[PDB]
Amino acid sequence: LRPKLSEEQQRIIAILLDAHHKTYDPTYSDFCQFRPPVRVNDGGGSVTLELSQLSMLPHLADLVSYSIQKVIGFAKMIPGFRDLTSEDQIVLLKSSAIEVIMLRSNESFTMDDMSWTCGNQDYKYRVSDVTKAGHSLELIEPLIKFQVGLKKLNLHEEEHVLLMAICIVSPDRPGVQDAALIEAIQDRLSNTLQTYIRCRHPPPLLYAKMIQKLADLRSLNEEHSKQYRCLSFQPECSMKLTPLVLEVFG
Ligand SMILES: C=C1/C(=C\C=C2/CCC[C@]3(C)[C@@H]([C@H](C)CCCC(C)(C)O)CC[C@@H]23)C[C@@H](O)C[C@@H]1O
């Protein structure tokens, strides 16, 4: 059976599309306001050199900080999110922040050359740029594989926004108080996504493949946390980050 989308489900999708359009600028016009990207010579991928310079960290920290602000705005518009206690809201935002950033970045990712292209060459991010920010291949390679796999699903924008919303409103995040309420909110979003796929997604499993990407994100979250810890050990590193980044990942 392929039941039609209820009026409420249609409304939820409309609200989420609007939220995304207001919080994700496809022209990347604000990027010139971030601290400039600096790319030192490191063809050898020297960990020692990368840590001593962290040349790309200020720019990426600013990009991520900016993105967390946009994610906060997006989350506030998810139907039901405001009904949660502020304590639960913050817990969900802090624990999903890096995951939603990885998801939303798929919009700028291109399989032409496996990079995140955000306008001019100055804002094109490749694997080598991430290593210049202090991260290792243990995170980057799996990150790229994730991007390609998500790209191949060819999600409708409707599916893309629902997935980011479901990622944020997850009842199994450590620290949540009212798991039952959170689960109710997520179920409403999940049922909307499942109904949309059966009804609006033409042939040629997609729902299952999407749920699996959420599990993949948990692993990337874990690895990023481990690497952020190592990064924080570097003297003078805090100055290369931002107060928001320090709080969310610290
Ligand atoms: C941000 C956005 C973009 C790209 C995401 C990328 C490319 C560069 C490296 C990033 C920022 C990854 C880094 C592993 C995260 C490092 C962060 C830190 C230095 C604090 O540990 C995660 C997602 C990656 C651009 C645009 O799509 C908006 C989006 O919102």
Query: Residue 41 belongs to a domain with what CATH number?
Result: 1.10.565.10
Q: Which atom of ligand 1 lies nearest, measured to the CA of 140?
A: 14
- Select from 227, 245, 246 the least CA-distant residue to 51: 227
Tell me the technique behind this structure. X-ray
Enumerate residues preceding breaks in the chain (C to N > 2.5 Å).
204
Instruction: Name the DSSP letter for residue 125.
Output: E
- Determine whether the shortest distance from the Cβ of 118 to ligand 1 is under 6 A: yes
Please name the helix (run of DSSP H) or strand (run of DSSP E) that holds residue 30, with its range, or none: none
User: To test ligand 1's pocket by mutation, which of 39, 63, 143 has the most ligand atoms within 8 angstroms of CB?
Assistant: 63
- Determine the Cα–Cα distance for residues 4 and 7; give it in Å rounded to an integer: 9
Are 183 and 92 within 8 A, CB to CB? no
Give the total number of structural domains in the chain: 1
- Determine whether the shortest distance from the Cβ of 140 to ligand 1 is under 6 A: no
- Determine the Cα–Cα distance for residues 205 and 211; give it in Å rounded to an integer: 10
Ligand 1 midpoint to CA 162 (Å): 20
- For residue 146, give both structure tokens: 């994730």
In this structure, the residue with its CA closest to atom 24 of ligand 1 is 102
- Determine whether the shortest distance from the Cβ of 132 to ligand 1 is under 6 A: no
- Determine whether the shortest distance from the Cβ of 186 to ligand 1 is under 6 A: no
- For residue 182, give both structure tokens: 């959170």
- Determine the Cα–Cα distance for residues 170 and 182; give it in Å rounded to an integer: 7
Are 150 and 213 within 8 A, CB to CB? yes
* C-alpha distances out from residue 163 to 10, 24, 46, 100, Å: 16, 15, 37, 9
Query: Would you state the torsion angle of the CA atoms of residues 221, 226, 227, 232, taken in this order, to the nearest 10 degrees?
Result: 120
Q: At which residue do the structure tokens 């990064």 appear?
A: 231
Domain span including residue 211: 1-250
